[PDB]
Design a protein around this ligand. Sequence first.
Ligand code: CL
Ligand code: CL
Ligand code: CL
Ligand code: CL
Ligand code: CL
Ligand code: CL
Ligand code: CL
Ligand code: CL
Lengths: 173, 173, 173, 173
Amino acid sequence: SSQIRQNYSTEVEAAVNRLVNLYLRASYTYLSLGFYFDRDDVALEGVCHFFRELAEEKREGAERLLKMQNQRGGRALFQDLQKPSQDEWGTTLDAMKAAIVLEKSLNQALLDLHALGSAQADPHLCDFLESHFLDEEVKLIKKMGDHLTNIQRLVGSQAGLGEYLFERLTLKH
Amino acid sequence: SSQIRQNYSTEVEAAVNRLVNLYLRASYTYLSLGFYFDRDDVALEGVCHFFRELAEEKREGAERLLKMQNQRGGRALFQDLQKPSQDEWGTTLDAMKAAIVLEKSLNQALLDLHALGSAQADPHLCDFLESHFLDEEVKLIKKMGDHLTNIQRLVGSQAGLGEYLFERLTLKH
Amino acid sequence: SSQIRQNYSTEVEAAVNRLVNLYLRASYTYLSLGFYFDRDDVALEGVCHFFRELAEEKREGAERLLKMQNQRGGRALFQDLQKPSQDEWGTTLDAMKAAIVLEKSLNQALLDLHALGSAQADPHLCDFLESHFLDEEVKLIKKMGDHLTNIQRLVGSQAGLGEYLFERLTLKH
Amino acid sequence: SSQIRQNYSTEVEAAVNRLVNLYLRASYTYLSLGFYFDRDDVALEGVCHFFRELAEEKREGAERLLKMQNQRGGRALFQDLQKPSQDEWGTTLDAMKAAIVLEKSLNQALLDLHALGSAQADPHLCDFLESHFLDEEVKLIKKMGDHLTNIQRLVGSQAGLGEYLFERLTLKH
Ligand SMILES: [Cl-]
Ligand SMILES: [Cl-]
Ligand SMILES: [Cl-]
Ligand SMILES: [Cl-]
Ligand SMILES: [Cl-]
Ligand SMILES: [Cl-]
Ligand SMILES: [Cl-]
Ligand SMILES: [Cl-]
């Protein structure tokens, strides 16, 4: 009903609101992951910083989707944000596995939205996802896969020592 | 089977390896074109530099495809590189015609890979080709068409003199 | 038959073309080694960078040989480039052993060409190899031997941990 | 008989004095070539500058040989300098052909001196020629071959016009 709305389906408008909820939920999961690694009995600063930076990136993604929703004449609708799936995240290896599962779920939601845009002949939506989300997700998932391989190679050798070395020598602090 | 691989078909993975082979073969053809124009009995420096710069551009294209293959969780496979189609490349006109035929063949391979990505609903692949290859190829083919027109206009007038003037006044040296 | 050719045997001209093929084959082997270490299930960035830099160095060596071939009035001839000897390169230790075998084979080809130049009384060729290839090869082989010793000392202690430490603390990233 | 002379044969000492005479004769030939192109009825400034720069390079070569003669404890002996082979040098094409014949004669004299040094087991002499003469000569002869090819391609088309264009667009002025 908006004065500007053109070629923007109700199906895509609703799917964009659901994707905003998924990105904010992911940002909240990363806030929990980051503060868990800042616990005095965990104390892996580089791991905390890696996840806190991802919490910011996911919030930025949600904000970009909200700006686009308004640019197209859709109406942002917010839903409750489910708490993260765990209260304690285990080792750096467990946390990095949970993060890659979370990113693959966001990536699948982006791919599903792109397919909906293609089905609705909405090229601005496809361009938007391609330009600001799809490549960023593939690059992040590759970086996480690289980190998992390095953590596994390290903790297979000597668990405690390996986790410390990965946080000191790979992660930023 | 990769931990990161998502929505990346075996058909696209294989086609990406074939495209890497085509770009490296093109880079090798440009190395041969460039050194032919550096022969003492050919001696057209600007022509040598034009083709050596294209050899670098094609190698860079292959490297970008290899980085993408790893980012998606595909596995790079290298095949023998066929030698260039000629040992001697004739005049600047003959060489520029061979170059435009080579570029149109690379462009067709990019278009075929884009169509495969569309058929496999792989938008990251389509975005990747659109962002880093399709426009660069159209711009290069246009530049080569412009060069062919200028060389033809020159060598139709006076062959030897025309080739020297094109190398001196159009090509970088 | 060239207007400039002087004291440049057909035996040396052909051996220079074969050496160009060997350097380009080595450059291709290093491209494969580098991208293997960039796989998400290998993920040793410093190792990838070490081999990608060597791919560039070998391509530069081939280009220097081609420039010399033209300076002497010889004619560059290109042959098919055989693919690298492996598709997967194992651990950093296995890869560094394959690299030193490859470099010793290039070094032997340089020594054989120098002996041919001496037999053909071609001092410009001997000076060219001495000035731009022989010392560079001895320095590279020594660096690779040093790396092999460090990797062995590390992976004999704890394989996974040792490989990570070598990539982090010796190789550039 | 010198206090410093060591491993320096009388054969090499005499051949070095003859090579100094050849380089000074070449410098004198280039002085004549340069001033011929400065005649008001020839008037090709870029050609004059190319040959005057070569007259300087050949004089510098003779000075380097004289310094080496004294460093080894040999005794410089100077002989009459024969005048250049022509008083008038024809076209730029004729002059560039005479220059390449002159350079190939200097190159052959360098190669003969290197072979004498090898026969007399005089590695300082071989290194001296390799470091300061052999590569410079090969590079100059290649440049002259490139110039001959360009002049021929130009004057085959239209003699007067081609010579002007080569002097304006290839040679420095
Ligand atoms: Cl609708
Ligand atoms: Cl919940
Ligand atoms: Cl598949
Ligand atoms: Cl072939
Ligand atoms: Cl021969
Ligand atoms: Cl093979
Ligand atoms: Cl003696
Ligand atoms: Cl005389």
